[PDB]
């Protein structure tokens, strides 16, 4: 005969890369002239 209805199987409720670590500025060497 006719059985009960069947419930549906539906649920029925791009990643931007994480910023990388850039290295810090390299401390540039700071020249005393002759007289």
């Amino acid at each position: 005969e006719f059985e009960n209805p069947e419930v549906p199987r539906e649920d029925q409720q791009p990643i931007i890369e994480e910023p990388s670590r850039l290295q810090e500025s390299v401390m540039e060497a700071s020249a005393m002239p002759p007289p």
């Binding site: 990388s20 850039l22 007289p35």
Partner: protein, 1424 residues
């Protein structure tokens, strides 16, 4: 000679000894000494001596000086003061000789000799003391000038000792002089040149600095301050800089005692004005240095504020300036608690005091500068407060609401402030006179910050004006680094606007300024590389690609580009953007060699380079300001800003560059059809703009988002975004839409700004698209004509305004090329609409007008030119012109077809390098139709290259990341797959030569026993679905076979089948909610019958006789011989294009060749003599019946975005064969490569049934499924997983990566806990059995290609993916899953899964409604 020098020294010593015993005046001896000195002077030219010799010389010289002083003391020279002065001059001459001897000895002194040099230094100290002692009593400028000469001589000798590391001895020699100068009264030595005094103190201070006696050296700095008592503080600006450097050494070492001693504490009793001036100079020097100097500057400003008397108006001005400095300090540091005053309060008080102050007609320039600075920092601090409150609001919320609430009177007020600052600075600097400011370096730094602000808020013209003022200042300051940097900024900005000529002039200015700088400093390298990059961009604009590429390659190969500094990082971003600009060009532009060289650097696709630029920009943001402005995480990070001048400019510059790069990424990705990533970038940019509260950028990105939503066909959301844009525009102009109907020349905020004009024109374009989509013609057309009329007017206004700003006489040669894309898109839409209406001639004229417009701009607007060429070919099209190019039919450019082929070839080579997803498919299928069997390999290649293009782009981007992450960890298979999927792997030649050899190699790579059939629909009007089916069969060692099936002439066309399938899905949706059981079942049965009829129609009418092109070829020789005879026997009956491979494939299935199939085949293939062809085909089938035997091979189905919906595997012919699906043929080749390199264990060894992870009923919505599967799954050996609970993502990642099988029995494809990005970020080593609803379905939104998680699984390397095509119920799919699992697992080792898939298809009750849902993606799998 050593002995000779010793004898001379002995003579000198004996003379000195005799002189000592000589009581009577040795006046004659003094004369003799003068002669000896003269001999030494003549020998002085040589300047060569030992050390005891120099010591003996010093001893003799000492006696000479003693005699000179003795004579001066003696009444003889005592009364004759002139003789005493002459005696002093004689001693001074001896001193000059001593200085020369010391310098010579020091120069010759080696590292080891330093010990004797130390002894000489002791003598030098005594000489300096004797010189100062003689100086005592000197009266008169000349006498003091003579004393200065003595000090200068000592200073020369001091430098020698300083260079000899004898810093202690050098300091000791200088100490006497410095001490006298430090303790000397004011105005005692006014003549003495300051630089001489500086030199003397410099050596001692630096010595005291290097030796680490900073404390001691700091006190001598006070003596250095005291020595220049009457000297202007400009000379004193060197001690101030030296002082801060001394204090910085203490700060680096952590010393606090030096930091305790400040200027007010040190002098303690100088005059208030000079003391305040020195405090101001100290603050300036601190602001020049790097590292955190917040508290030091705060202390200096606190003493400055204490000094300033508020009652005196000059004191009021001083307090206003110091309050501006205090606002700068408080505006980035948490010092409010101590001062009990916010930065905004300080700046408002300062502005009030400034407004109160009246100038004295000589300090008006400084009044202007101070007011401008106060206004600028008011803006900056209010912007900081706005950003902080935005971060807090987003943290509390953790959209679409703030986006429409940006424009407030605050924006008008906040901006007015910036324009007032710009006007004040422009008034100050535009006059000829050099501004009489205190520090013109601050006017320069603040102008830089203002230009960065103006660019950030999307007002590039005022930024150009500010940069011109900065150039004026740098020329006035004679600082060439700043001049070159400003010129480079102006050139880059002008290139962004679209005027290359002014960019060329300013690049020449930058180079000319660059010649002055030293060619060793890092700034020179930065500016030279920037100039080369700008020249490369200019050549790229002026169609000088060859030379431009060489410059770019030179820039990229320069090792200096990869230094660790923020300036280099910002340069690399522009390098990557220029790489993208070059990579966007067609192949005709550059030679193959240079194309390979450019792609060998690391970036293949323009989107890859732009994404890398975006990532680098965000990395710079992270390094500079932290991560709060990007991510709204609770206390993500708290990195200090560390404002030191350049940091403040770089903050705003990086934010503006992030926004601009996000625009190019969104536009480029949306143009290509990749709308999901484009929307992701558009939303990230809108979030950033929401935090910063900038209505202009929000409006621009909202328009872009509306365009993307129109592309995805979501009119409601697109209309919402357009309405928000309309609110923002109507608020901006205040603080059919009314912003139209303007004069061609107008100065409203919208008309005077190119950015706002572009936003308005794009709004009109998107609204026209919406009207056309919603069926409202005659309105979208009108909006498109509005865009057509508006773009040239906006270009002319931009030209006029640039002419006004830069003050040139010659107008630009060409109008800026920035609205060309909008105008080309409008032309494309107008021509596409004219396709629908051939009666209207106006759109026919629009087609040609757009063609001229895009042909006049090559190679910039190539995609639009390709679209217009395709529309032109379609117009020339109007049983077909393609019938003559195919062997089977349903039962001036020479001719039209050749001209169409030429135009389509031009379009193809115009887009082949980076093709849009839809246009590429259209061109490929139209060109395949036009070509046919005339060029079979070209037709097969074109049909293959029209399926899954967005998947190709996504795979290219994914392979880049896999390579970048591997390079970071540390690749041959990845490089090979990149070459396989590349659009630039072709050689140089004419179409289709280069494309053919590539396809021939790909065909040679086909695995044995695999048939690849591509079913694509040819569309004769883009945006619709065609009724012509293109079938191409590809097999190893077999020429490709292509066929065309026009289904439109007969009833039951492919469009009707698609409509019926959609109706079945819709009816199933509606019926799923019915409560009654007696109606639900009846509806389900009716739908099952309808779907059965649909599959029967697919087998019978859609394909017809050409259903055997999907069946395995017979290995028996019978079909080969029959084809060999019948080719010659049928060429005579009217077969235009004889093909043995076609006959072989079709006859391999002679057993299943119904007489209707033979009738159709004969009557179409041979229309001149149909009966005879039928007779021979029947005889061949009779000879081949029974003789042929079934083979053992595999079939791969490659279907376009419309055909994946239909269940092709459920047709009667295919119901007993292993059939799978793949996005493209390139994916089968990639699988072969990966299997060759051993990266797919499942495809190589087999599925181990002891390694399975199952997810069962996650959210507890299904009880039958759990009760049916729980015990069965738990009882299995070695199976783990979850049941009744959602699974953790790190569990499912391990399930996919470290397991051979993965069974999912639940809702959907499991996207809630396993997104597409998650699976794409890992390697799939499992066979995904997803038994949800629409698990293997590709959602087709608009004209975009199908999107789904199955593509992510395949690109991740999944061997086989089993999923349902349409929504399913629970009990029937439970039955199918049970049948499939039981059959496959109980079959023992070596059991193919596809056979049991097709077997279990007979398990469900509704055979065709449920069993036909599952499909397979990938390659066949079996147990080990």
């Amino acid at each position: 000679g050593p002995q000779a020098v010793a004898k001379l020294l002995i003579k000198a010593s004996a003379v000195l000894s005799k002189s000592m015993e000589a009581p009577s005046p040795p006046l004659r001896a003094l004369y003799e000494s003068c002669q000896f000195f003269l001999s030494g002077l003549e020998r002085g030219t040589k300047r060569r001596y030992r050390l005891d010799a120099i010591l003996s010389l010093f001893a003799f010289l000492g006696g000479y000086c003693s005699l000179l002083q003795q004579l001066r003391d003696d009444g003889v020279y005592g009364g004759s003061s002139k003789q005493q002065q002459s005696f002093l001059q004689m001693y001074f001459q001896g001193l000059h000789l001593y200085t020369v001897v010391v310098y010579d000895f020091a120069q010759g002194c080696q590292i080891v000799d330093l010990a004797d040099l130390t002894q000489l230094v002791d003598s030098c100290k005594s000489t300096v003391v004797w010189m100062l002692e003689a100086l005592e009593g000197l009266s008169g400028q000349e006498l003091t000038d003579h004393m200065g000469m003595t000090a200068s001589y000592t200073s020369n000798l001091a430098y020698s000792f300083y260079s000899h590391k004898l810093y202690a001895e050098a300091c000791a020699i200088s100490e006497p002089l410095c001490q006298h100068l430090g303790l000397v009264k004011p105005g005692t030595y006014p003549e003495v040149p300051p630089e001489k005094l500086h030199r003397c103190f410099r050596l001692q201070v630096e010595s005291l600095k290097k030796l680490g006696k900073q404390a001691q050296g700091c006190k001598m700095v006070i003596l250095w301050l005291a020595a220049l008592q009457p000297c202007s503080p400009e000379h004193m600006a060197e001690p101030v800089t030296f002082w801060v450097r001394v204090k910085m050494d203490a700060a680096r070492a952590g010393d606090k005692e030096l930091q305790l001693k400040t200027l007010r504490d040190s002098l303690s009793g100088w005059d208030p004005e000079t003391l305040a001036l020195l405090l101001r100079e100290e603050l300036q020097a601190y602001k020049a240095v790097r590292a955190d100097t917040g508290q030091e500057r705060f202390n200096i400003i606190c003493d400055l504020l204490e000094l300033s008397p508020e009652e005196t108006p000059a004191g009021a001005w001083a307090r206003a300036t110091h309050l501006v400095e205090l606002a700068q300090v408080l505006c980035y540091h948490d010092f409010t608690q101590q001062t009990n005053c916010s930065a905004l309060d300080a700046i408002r008080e300062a502005l009030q005091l400034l407004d109160s102050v009246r100038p004295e007609a000589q300090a008006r320039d400084q009044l202007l500068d101070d007011k401008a600075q106060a206004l600028l920092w008011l803006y900056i601090c209010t912007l900081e407060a706005k950003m902080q409150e935005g971060i807090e609001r987003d943290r509390r919320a953790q959209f679409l609401y703030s986006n429409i609430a940006f424009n407030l009177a605050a924006d008008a007020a906040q901006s007015k402030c910036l324009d007032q600052a710009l006007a004040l600075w422009k008034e100050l600097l535009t006059k000829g006179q050099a501004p009489a400011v205190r520090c013109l370096q601050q006017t320069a730094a603040s102008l830089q910050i203002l230009a960065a602000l103006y660019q950030l808020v999307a007002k590039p013209m005022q930024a150009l004006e500010v940069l011109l003022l900065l150039r004026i200042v740098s020329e006035r300051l004679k600082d060439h680094s700043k001049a070159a940097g400003s010129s480079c900024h102006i050139t880059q900005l002008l290139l962004t606007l679209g005027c290359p000529s002014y960019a060329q002039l300013h690049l020449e200015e930058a180079a000319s300024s660059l010649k002055h700088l030293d060619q060793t400093t890092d700034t020179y390298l930065l500016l030279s590389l920037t100039c080369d990059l700008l020249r490369s961009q200019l050549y790229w604009t002026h169609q000088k690609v060859t030379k431009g590429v060489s410059l770019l390659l030179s820039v990229l190969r320069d090792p200096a580009l990869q230094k660790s500094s923020k300036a280099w990082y910002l340069l690399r971003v522009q390098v990557l953007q220029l790489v993208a600009a070059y990579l966007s060009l067609p192949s005709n532009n550059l030679s193959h060699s240079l194309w390979e060289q450019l792609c060998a650097q690391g970036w293949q696709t323009p989107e890859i380079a732009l994404i890398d630029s975006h990532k680098l920009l965000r990395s710079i943001i992270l390094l500079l300001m932290g991560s709060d402005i990007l991510s709204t995480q609770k206390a993500a990070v708290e990195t200090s800003f560390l404002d030191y001048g350049e940091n403040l400019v770089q903050k705003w510059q990086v934010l503006s560059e992030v926004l601009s790069c996000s625009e190019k990424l969104v536009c480029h990705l949306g143009r290509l059809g990749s709308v999901s990533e484009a929307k992701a970038f558009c939303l990230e940019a809108l979030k950033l703009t929401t935090k910063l509260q900038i209505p202009r950028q929000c409006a621009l990105f909202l328009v872009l988002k509306g365009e993307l939503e129109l592309a995805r066909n979501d009119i409601d959301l697109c209309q919402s975004d357009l309405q928000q844009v309309l609110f923002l525009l109507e608020s901006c102009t205040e603080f059919i839409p009314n912003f139209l109907s303007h004069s061609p020349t107008c100065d409203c905020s919208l008309c005077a700004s190119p950015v706002l004009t572009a936003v308005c024109l794009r709004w009109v374009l998107v609204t026209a698209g919406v009207r056309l989509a919603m069926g409202h013609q005659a309105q979208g057309l009108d909006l498109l004509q509005v865009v057509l009329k508006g773009c040239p007017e906006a270009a002319e206004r931009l030209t006029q305004a640039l002419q006004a700003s830069l003050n040139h006489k010659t107008p630009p040669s060409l109008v800026p090329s920035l609205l060309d894309e909008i105008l080309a898109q409008a032309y494309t839409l107008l021509a596409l609409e004219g396709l629908n209406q051939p009666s209207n001639e106006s759109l026919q004229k629009v087609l040609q007008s757009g063609l001229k417009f895009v042909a006049a701009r090559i190679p910039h607007l190539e995609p639009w030119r390709a679209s217009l060429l395709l529309i032109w070919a379609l117009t020339k099209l109007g049983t077909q012109l393609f019938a003559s190019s195919w062997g089977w039919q349903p039962p001036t450019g020479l001719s039209t077809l050749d001209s169409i082929c030429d135009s389509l070839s031009v379009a193809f080579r115009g887009i082949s390098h980076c093709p849009p997803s839809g246009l590429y498919a259209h061109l490929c299928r139209f060109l395949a139709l036009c070509l046919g069997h005339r060029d079979p390999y070209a037709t097969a290649f074109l049909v293959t290259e029209s399926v899954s293009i967005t998947c190709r782009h996504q795979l290219l981007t994914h392979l880049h990341r896999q390579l970048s992450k591997a390079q970071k960890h540390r690749d041959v298979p990845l490089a090979r797959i990149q070459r396989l999927f590349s659009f630039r792997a072709l050689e140089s030649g004419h179409f289709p030569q280069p494309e053919k050899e590539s396809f021939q190699e790909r065909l040679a790579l086909i695995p044995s026993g695999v048939t690849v059939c591509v079913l694509a629909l040819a569309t004769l009007q883009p945006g619709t679905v065609g009724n012509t089916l293109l079938l191409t069969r590809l097999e190893k060692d077999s020429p490709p076979v292509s066929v065309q099936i026009p289904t439109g002439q007969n009833k039951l066309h492919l469009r009707s089948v698609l409509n019926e399938f959609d109706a079945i899905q819709k009816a199933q949706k509606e019926n799923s909610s019915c409560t009654d059981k007696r109606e639900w079942w009846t509806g389900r049965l009716a739908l099952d019958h309808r779907m059965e009829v649909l599959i029967a129609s697919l087998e019978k009418s859609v394909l017809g006789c050409w259903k055997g092109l999907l069946l395995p070829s017979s290995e028996e020789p019978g079909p080969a011989q029959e084809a060999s005879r019948l080719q010659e026997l049928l060429q005579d009956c009217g077969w235009k294009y004889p093909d043995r491979t076609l006959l072989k494939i079709m006859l391999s299935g002679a057993g299943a060749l119904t007489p209707q199939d033979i009738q159709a085949l004969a009557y179409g293939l041979c229309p001149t003599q149909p009966e005879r062809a039928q007779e021979l085909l029947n005889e061949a089938v009779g000879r081949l019946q029974g003789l042929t035997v079934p083979s053992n091979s595999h079939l791969v189905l490659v279907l376009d975005k419309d055909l994946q919906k239909l269940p092709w595997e459920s047709m009667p012919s295919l119901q007993a064969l292993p059939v799978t699906r793949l996005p493209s043929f390139r994916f089968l080749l990639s699988y072969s490569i990966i299997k060759e390199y051993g990266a797919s264990p499942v495809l190589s060894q087999g599925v181990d049934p002891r390694s399975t992870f199952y997810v069962l009923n996650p959210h507890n919505n299904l009880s039958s499924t759990e009760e049916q599967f729980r015990a069965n799954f738990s009882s299995e050996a070695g199976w783990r997983g979850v049941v009744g609970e959602v699974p953790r993502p790190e569990q499912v990642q391990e399930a996919l990566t470290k397991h051979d099988l993965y069974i999912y029995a639940g809702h959907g494809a499991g996207a809630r806990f396993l997104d597409g990005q998650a699976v794409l970020r890992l390697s799939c080593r499992a066979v995904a059995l997803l038994f949800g609803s629409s698990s293997a379905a590709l959602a087709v939104h608009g004209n975009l290609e199908g999107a789904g998680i199955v593509l992510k699984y395949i690109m991740a390397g999944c061997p086989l993916f089993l999923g349902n095509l349409w929504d399913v119920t629970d009990r029937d799919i439970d039955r199918y899953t049970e049948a499939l699992l039981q059959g496959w697992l109980g079959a023992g080792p070596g059991a193919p899964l596809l056979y049991y898939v097709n077997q279990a298809r007979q398990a469900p009750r509704l055979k065709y409604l449920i069993g036909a849902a599952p499909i397979a993606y990938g390659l066949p799998v079996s147990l080990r």
